[PDB]
Design a protein around this ligand. Structure first.
Ligand SMILES: [Ir+3]
Ligand SMILES: [Ir+3]
Ligand SMILES: [Ir+3]
Ligand SMILES: [Ir+3]
Ligand SMILES: [Ir+3]
Ligand SMILES: [Ir+3]
Ligand SMILES: [Ir+3]
Ligand SMILES: [Ir+3]
Ligand SMILES: [Ir+3]
Ligand SMILES: [Ir+3]
Ligand SMILES: [Ir+3]
Ligand SMILES: [Ir+3]
Ligand SMILES: [Ir+3]
Ligand SMILES: [Ir+3]
Ligand SMILES: [Ir+3]
Ligand SMILES: [Ir+3]
Ligand SMILES: [Ir+3]
Ligand SMILES: [Ir+3]
Ligand SMILES: [Ir+3]
Ligand SMILES: [Ir+3]
Ligand SMILES: [Ir+4]
Ligand SMILES: [Ir+4]
Ligand SMILES: [Ir+4]
Ligand SMILES: [Ir+4]
Ligand SMILES: [Pd+2]
Ligand SMILES: [Pd+2]
Ligand SMILES: [Pd+2]
Ligand SMILES: [Pd+2]
Lengths: 172, 172, 172, 172
């Protein structure tokens, strides 16, 4: 039961629980990415650290969503967290591409919940999404895009040298 | 007259004046609640202090609304402030229930003004409401709900002991 | 590939990957426990905070295991993380019981990996387990047991009062 | 004579003296490696410094073993220290390979002494080895492996440029 729930639809409550699963799944993905780049046969620390910090951001995102769910009187429901899509992530370029795909899917999920909030006339939700999630995703996606462009420029015909340099001088 | 008013309907101007009266009425209510719990025959300081701090928050809310009304070129109009609904407020449980009812009515009023702002295409209003009022009401209502649950748990068959303990260890 | 792997069996590598899943599953469980006690209709902050800090410990445990897997030249493999066993966790007593059951299962898993390490003559593993996991589990299980005894003592015929007091004065 | 020796076999005493020779031999090897990279015609300072710091670690390892030998009532016996395997060490890649081979041989020696300690039921020995030597060797071997992977990536078709960059940006 709740004695506080007001203007908080069951449709929004469910979408929020699905978004928590997506953020947690994203955190798991980034955990796998991070550790992949710490393999002795991959050994790009800067990449490890970039992805591990993203794991932590996505976990924090889920936690903020859960706290908001309780603030509105909604009920957290957790599902299975699906294993990441790959067991090995190839090059930094391959990984950065996979990260951007992931983030775009999270952003589209937030866009979808915002739409549903407008359709439900729930301005607290739409406010919460904007401040804490939408702006963050846009900034993060721009940083990833910038990274991908710099990695692409560095491939050329010297791909090993380029992957080292990016790691040392960007991820730095 | 005003030389600044832009995109600010007479309907929003009136709703803002009604919301100022509701916040001020709420502040008055909480003043009465606070002093009730300072009666020698009630004597729960922690409760006094909880309600008096809410009186101050609601007054500040009204003041922020009034400042915003002038910022938009609207004209403050004050009405009679109706005396609080009760002269004595019973137990902490009764009081916390009355507070939650009050806050929910304020929240619904803010929701109503937001709706009217969307219908009027006034995004400054909808922004102002979100940041300074809607998030605050959700947090406050959750805290009140948490309090009510803890008070309810403490009643049991030892209601005096429970009311003391909550006051001492929560309101603390 | 690895150029470093030495004295590190495929059986230990797999058991380490299973233990990472168990620690992560435990972290997820504790996340669900934490948020349950932050429901407005449960509202025991101290319990929220106890379980959330355990979520963080178990995540750190998994991370340490993953770092060790790479240090030995083993390859992380992630599986589905199964949703926690319950969606609502009942009383603090019920929850503390569930936590102790969980921790005992983790401890038995560590015991099992240690046995396998002896059978494999892998003293680095057995060392790593002892310092970072076995001592920690024993201390944590003793704290949980102490908590359970104090909760049990407090039930009596005044269960609500007892649950409040434990939260306020132990979890404090 | 000794008035303190307890549970300390002559087989362990001899293995400890052989391990001291191996650590000292390793220290000598790293001294030769360090100075090779300070030749005017090699001139990679970062490599000099990496190997010289390893010379010092291995000397400290031997000293700790000797102190432990006396702590148990065993008697240090020193042998000839064989000259390093090469007089010139080729590229950083060649050197890092030789270092990893060396470290793996030290690790296997520690593994062998641990086995012998279990067979002798000497838990102090097995404890001493773990804390001060086994964990250190695993960390060092992982760092070397990481280095070798980065050097390999940098060779490509620009081996001089790659060797400079690694020295400047990793060994740094
Ligand atoms: Ir950092
Ligand atoms: Ir950082
Ligand atoms: Ir960082
Ligand atoms: Ir919106
Ligand atoms: Ir929020
Ligand atoms: Ir105060
Ligand atoms: Ir205060
Ligand atoms: Ir106060
Ligand atoms: Ir709006
Ligand atoms: Ir404003
Ligand atoms: Ir804390
Ligand atoms: Ir704490
Ligand atoms: Ir804490
Ligand atoms: Ir063991
Ligand atoms: Ir370890
Ligand atoms: Ir130095
Ligand atoms: Ir240094
Ligand atoms: Ir140094
Ligand atoms: Ir042993
Ligand atoms: Ir020792
Ligand atoms: Ir820089
Ligand atoms: Ir640097
Ligand atoms: Ir205390
Ligand atoms: Ir306190
Ligand atoms: Pd919005
Ligand atoms: Pd708005
Ligand atoms: Pd052990
Ligand atoms: Pd040992």
């Amino acid at each position: 039961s709740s004695q506080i729930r007001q203007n908080y639809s069951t449709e929004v409550e469910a979408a929020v629980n699905r978004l928590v699963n997506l953020y947690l799944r994203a955190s798991y993905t980034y955990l796998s990415l991070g550790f992949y780049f710490d393999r002795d046969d991959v050994a790009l620390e800067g990449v490890c650290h970039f992805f591990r910090e993203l794991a932590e951001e996505k976990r924090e995102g889920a936690e903020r969503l859960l706290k908001m769910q309780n603030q509105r009187g909604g009920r957290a429901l957790f599902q299975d967290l699906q294993k990441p899509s790959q067991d090995e992530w190839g090059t930094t370029l391959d990984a950065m591409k996979a990260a951007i795909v992931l983030e775009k899917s999270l952003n589209q999920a937030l866009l979808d919940l915002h739409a549903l909030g407008s359709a439900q006339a729930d301005p607290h939700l739409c406010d919460f999404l904007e401040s804490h999630f939408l702006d963050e995703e846009v900034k993060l996606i721009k940083k990833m895009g910038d990274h991908l462009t710099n990695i692409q420029r560095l491939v050329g015909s010297q791909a090993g040298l380029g992957e080292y340099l990016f790691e040392r001088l960007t991820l730095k």
